[PDB]
Amino acid sequence: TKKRRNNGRAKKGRGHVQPIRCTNCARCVPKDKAIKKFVIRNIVEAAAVRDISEASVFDAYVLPKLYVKLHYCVSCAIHSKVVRNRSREARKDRTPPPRFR
């Protein structure tokens, strides 16, 4: 039977989209079908962010961040717990999880 109305992708009027590889494996996944994660993160998070600050020559120097646009496949994201299975009524919800931490 039909599990998803959009068949787990954003392709509606195209019919063909360019594939992209994965981060863990080299799986060829369509761009709209891939689970895309964009993570804003510092180079150092909790411990190394402190001791480098007094070790920095330039006082009051903000540490640069790192930007990585992640592209996971269906098997890779679920195994790495990026996304998880939901109930038939919980599938239709597509709002992002709340962001506070």
Add this chain to the structure above:
Amino acid sequence: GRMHAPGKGLSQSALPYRRSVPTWLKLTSDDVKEQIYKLAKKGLTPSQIGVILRDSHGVAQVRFVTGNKILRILKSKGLAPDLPEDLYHLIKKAVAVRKHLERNRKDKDAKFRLILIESRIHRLARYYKTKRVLPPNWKYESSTASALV
């Protein structure tokens, strides 16, 4: 609902209900006709006489002011062209696609586009055969169509 396109657009003219002549128009039927004869003498397809007359001369419709329409007036005086205007512009468009296809023969999209006009030309060709405005043995020949502009 275009017959050679998947588009279903709705955009065309809509004449008002009243067929009476406008109150701002003081040009009589013969003065409109001599204006029509002036535009037709210098070379102009009947589509364009109707265009510029409502722009500068301020006429609503030629059929309401005069007794006849634009092509019918030219047919009475013999100023109408040898072949109708919709077939002429289709042949002109078909020549340009074929001329473009001579250089860009890799253009498969333009190659597919070529059959559509020749499909559209033949529909107009056999229709005008039944209306007896074309000779019964007239046939659109692609190689000799470049002589006609």
Add this chain to the structure above:
Amino acid sequence: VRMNVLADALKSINNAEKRGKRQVLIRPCSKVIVRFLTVMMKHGYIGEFEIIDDHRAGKIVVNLTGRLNKCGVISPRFDVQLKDLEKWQNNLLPSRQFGFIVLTTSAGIMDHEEARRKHTGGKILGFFF
């Protein structure tokens, strides 16, 4: 494209009757449809209709009552003899107490009772009850 005109008019007012609209507009106006509407009005199945005669195919606004169940159309217009006209209404009308099959004859357009009175057959148009 629009092949049949009466078929589009009858189904448009049948969709409005199912929803129960007080009045309904049909986009084409034809002589057959006007004759079709006059057949139903003498029997009181619908409310009073009017046409808007512009300089094109006119538009007809038909007031509706709640007395209409279904007004169908039979395409193509099969010719109907006097012998099997009972056979046509057996498998089309709900009952013999009511239900009207209208069909065009040389005398005009009328229901199946009046065609029996004038003893004239013709081609079928549609059914309504």
Add this chain to the structure above:
Amino acid sequence: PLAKDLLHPSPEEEKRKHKKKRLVQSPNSYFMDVKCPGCYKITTVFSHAQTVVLCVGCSTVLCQPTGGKARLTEGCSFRRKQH
């Protein structure tokens, strides 16, 4: 809702509907009495004239073709007419 006044549609929504989809098919175009500041003579111009309009004696241009209504030359007084 069910009951509507198709007999007598209100002015406010009649102009809102599409020009072909009106109860009576009426255009949205019109004509106006354009008077350029360069000269004196009154010219009749279509609202969607889509063509170049030039004054008498080639004094100044009047209207520019656009996708919709023709753009009037600035300073040209115009008075919309009807019949």
Add this chain to the structure above:
Amino acid sequence: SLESINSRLQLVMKSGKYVLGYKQSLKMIRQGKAKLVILANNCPALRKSEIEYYAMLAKTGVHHYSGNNIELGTACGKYYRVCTLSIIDPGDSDIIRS
């Protein structure tokens, strides 16, 4: 503006007076009747220079046409190549005013 010239040429063919060919058009420059000269780009360079010298004495404008003689005949509505075209009477066209 190239397509406009083909429309002017088509208008002259049906209404106005014209002379086709090189030798017959060279006489019309010499009688002074022709006002505009059309020359294809594939005409001989000796013939290109002689036409312009003939027209300079006659004060006749020369319009060097874009393409070759093969398409110039089709632009004139004919079925043969034409290198030199001379317009005797435009009649009802604006070809000479552009």
Add this chain to the structure above:
Amino acid sequence: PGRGAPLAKVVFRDPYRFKKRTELFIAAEGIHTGQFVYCGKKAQLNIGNVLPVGTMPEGTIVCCLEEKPGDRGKLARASGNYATVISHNPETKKTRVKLPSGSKKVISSANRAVVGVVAGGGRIDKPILKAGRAYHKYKAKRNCWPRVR
């Protein structure tokens, strides 16, 4: 005879004595009879116009290239073959030029080459079908065709 590349007779004017000097050039593809072919340093860059390599822009297609200044052309002169300019070097008056074998050779900037590919290209794509065509080909060149293993 014995050479697939056509030859062109070019006639010059002697600048010191009242005489006309003729040469036997190697015809680049596109050369027609009755055409001014120029020869010198101040020459323009078009097909069939020999000028020194050091004046040429990058990637110029040439043939009949001199391998030494003044030896009247030795390199890249078979039918359908050509040479390209790789890179210039203003000092030491040298220029890298590749050869149809694919090898890249540093050559002086003083020598010259005629711009274009040699006419008669594509000769080897036609297969010889019978022994007669190959017998007549080598008979004009030398006695080397019948090869016993």
Add this chain to the structure above:
Amino acid sequence: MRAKWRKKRMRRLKRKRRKMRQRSK
């Protein structure tokens, strides 16, 4: 047996019948 490989087995078997019938003629 997947439906894909039984089609591939048929084509290998059909091609085998092509060579066997060809040598007899």
Add this chain to the structure above:
Amino acid sequence: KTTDGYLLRLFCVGFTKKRNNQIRKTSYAQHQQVRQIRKKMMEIMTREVQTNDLKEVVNKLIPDSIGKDIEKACQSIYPLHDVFVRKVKMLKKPKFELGKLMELHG
């Protein structure tokens, strides 16, 4: 190329800005607007670099003086905000003679 033989390949970047009162999430621009932005966005480089040699254009790279002009000149096309010149690449230098380097070093 500058007045001297310093021939450069410059690179700039632009970013359309969501307006303060804009409610629309997309905030995109038309394709012809991008082509109309980039034709003004390129000619500014040719105006700043051709008129002088390296000493002033480098002095224009310490601030965003090339990128500031690009941001304000294209406000009539689309109000882009996040404009800088992103990369300047050396391509061809003339002959190095030591006298040129001294006035660049005091």
Add this chain to the structure above:
Amino acid sequence: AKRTKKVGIVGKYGTRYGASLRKMVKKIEISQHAKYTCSFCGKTKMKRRAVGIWHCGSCMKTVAGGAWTYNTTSAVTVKSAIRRLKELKDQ
């Protein structure tokens, strides 16, 4: 009528030389005797007289071209490339 099914000019070769050699010869053999449009006169009078030369039957004008075709695909690309660098030098 149509004399042969799928062999044209290579029908003179008979059953010799194989099908594929006769097939690839056919494209070259047809083109080396076909006539091409003159760029000077316009009359189609480009006939191959020898290897690499093409002569005009109207202008009496010999043009140095390809071995089998009037213009090879490589030489046309060179002519566009040389003209592009011609105006690049003098601006």
Add this chain to the structure above:
RNA sequence: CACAUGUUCC
């Protein structure tokens, strides 16, 4: 990093 398979009736 491997976890291959175990005749039938209710």
Add this chain to the structure above:
RNA sequence: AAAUUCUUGGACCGGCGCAAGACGGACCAGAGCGAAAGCAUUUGCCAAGAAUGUUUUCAUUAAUCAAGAACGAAAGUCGGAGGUUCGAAGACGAUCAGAUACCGUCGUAGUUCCGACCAUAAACGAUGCCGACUGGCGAUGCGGCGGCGUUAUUCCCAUGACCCGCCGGGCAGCUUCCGGGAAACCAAAGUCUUUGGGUUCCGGGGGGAGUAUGGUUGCAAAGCUGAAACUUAAAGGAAUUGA
């Protein structure tokens, strides 16, 4: 996890360059275009196209179509060019009872460009094409219309960028007892036992079998049409509860 592999003959790494061939990230979206396949660096040229606007022209010229024809993913074939990366086959090192697989190092064909074949895909919206009607709701693409106002050229009208609405269709989404369906679900999969708007293609339990044979195309691979003998009482679809 190791090994196959390179390495004092200097591997790996850093810097400056050079050359080659692929590819076009982030911007990139339940967005746009195209009949479909499909289409993403800048710019120029050529021809084409939908929608909008139109008091412009003709006046039924229209809808679906067997025969026929054009295009047609990837893989594959034939000639050349080039072959960076990846990579069928194959070699080697691991794992296992065995790997002839999954893992790792190489790597032919191929993957890249041009000219010809090939016409097959889960070529899917698993939903033929034209016409009408049947609830709303917020978006979004284009074009047009109207309107307070903020903001640029600056010197504002008008044009740009926003904001508030309306119109046509363009891809969609949300919502509900319209209605339907075996249900999953569907603004079409509704307007159907109250059964008829028009026109093509196609199916009759499951295998045999898309097989044999015959015909036809193709260089080949294979493409189109296409059985019977015989065997079988179930196969299958949706949904519920356990395991």
